[PDB]
Amino acid sequence: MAALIDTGIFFGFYSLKDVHHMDSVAIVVHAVEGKWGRLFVTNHILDETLTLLKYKKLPADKFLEGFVESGVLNIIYTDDEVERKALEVFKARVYEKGFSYTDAISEVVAEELKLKLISYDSRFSLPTIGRDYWKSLDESERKRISAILREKGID
Amino acid sequence: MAALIDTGIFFGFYSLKDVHHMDSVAIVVHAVEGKWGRLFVTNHILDETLTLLKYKKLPADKFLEGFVESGVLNIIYTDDEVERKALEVFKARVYEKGFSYTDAISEVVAEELKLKLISYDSRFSLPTIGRDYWKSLDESERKRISAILREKGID
């Protein structure tokens, strides 16, 4: 039906030496091919991703053109009621390492809109898609995706 | 009338060894005393601040209680029209080091709502308040603020 895609997916896609790089290539190919239906980010994920890609000297410009300007991703602009709940979640987890306000927003939004959460972050309270994605595919599917990667020059 | 307070202000306040620490103490005291009127953050600044304080092992909890739950800060939840403009600003500055999507939002919001921008970030297109704030005060005002700092135990 619909998915919410976490920052780390996009980071893995552009960061060539990242441990999740092939995970991200495969997830991105499947996502744009429609595997999980309509694709969302929150405006918090959007901010985090743009800022991080730019900070890490990665193709923020290509992310913009390819994912955002293309309308490949739909953006959810979170209102005061979503953020009030996210703040409660954030406060509850304030002492837990590595749980951001972005993540708090992601949990509220994915739960309220019944979105599949695509993320490498193993700390979410909702099940996620992403970990060991590349290694879980058919060998034939790997070959197909690898061909797309090097031939069509995605990245 | 009203001010928009940037993340770096809050970071300087809690980071005791930060170069801007006394800058932030002084700005925070003046702000809560009403010098610039009503105080705002965007939900992007809110996210950035909460996440960063927590990441740096600083009192995210005390920030929440003291600034957010207290209603000392008002939060602006940015809509699709503000974000559409921020995206244009971000794209224009994509190759410029250190300009975030949060900053893009801050520029749009402060310009549209005629907010004073309180920030150490010397890269904004709007004038800002913050740089050399501590060194610019009367010696008597420094002493008053220092007394508040060590006596009332703010931080």
Instruction: Please list, in sequence order, all residues whose beta carbon lies within 8 angstroms of the beta carbon of residue B14, skipping any fewer than 6 positions away.
Output: B53, B58, B59, B62, B63, B155
Q: How far is the alpha carbon of A74 from chain B, nearest alpha carbon, in Å?
A: 12
Does B80 count as an annotated binding residue? no
Tell me the CA end-to-end span of chain B in Å, nearest whole number. Answer: 26
Strand positions, DSSP E, chain A: 2-5, 38-42, 74-76, 116-118, 128-129
Distance (Å, rounded) from C-alpha B41 to C-alpha B137? 25
Q: Determine whether the interchain pair B77/A83 forms a contact, defined as Cβ–Cβ distance below 8 Å.
A: yes
- DSSP H helices in B33-100: 43-55, 60-63, 80-92
Q: Taking the C-alpha atoms of B116, B118, B119 and B123 in order, what is their torsion angle to the nearest 10 degrees?
A: 10
Cβ atoms A79, B76 nearer than 8 A: no
Alpha-carbon distance of B15 to B121, in angstroms, equals 17
| Residues of chain B found within 8 Å of residue A43, distances taken between Cβ atoms | 44, 78, 83
Method for this entry = X-ray
- Among the partner-chain residues B75, B80, B100, the one whose CB lies closest to the CB of A51 is B100
Q: What is the resolution of this structure in A?
A: 2.1
Chain centre to alpha carbon of residue A15: 14
Contact (CB, 8 A) for A45 and A148: no
User: Any idea which residue has 């060590």 for tokens?
Assistant: B150
Alpha carbon distances (Å) from A55 to A5, A50, A61, A104: 20, 9, 12, 23
Sketch out chain A's domains with CATH numbers. 2-155 (3.40.50.1010)
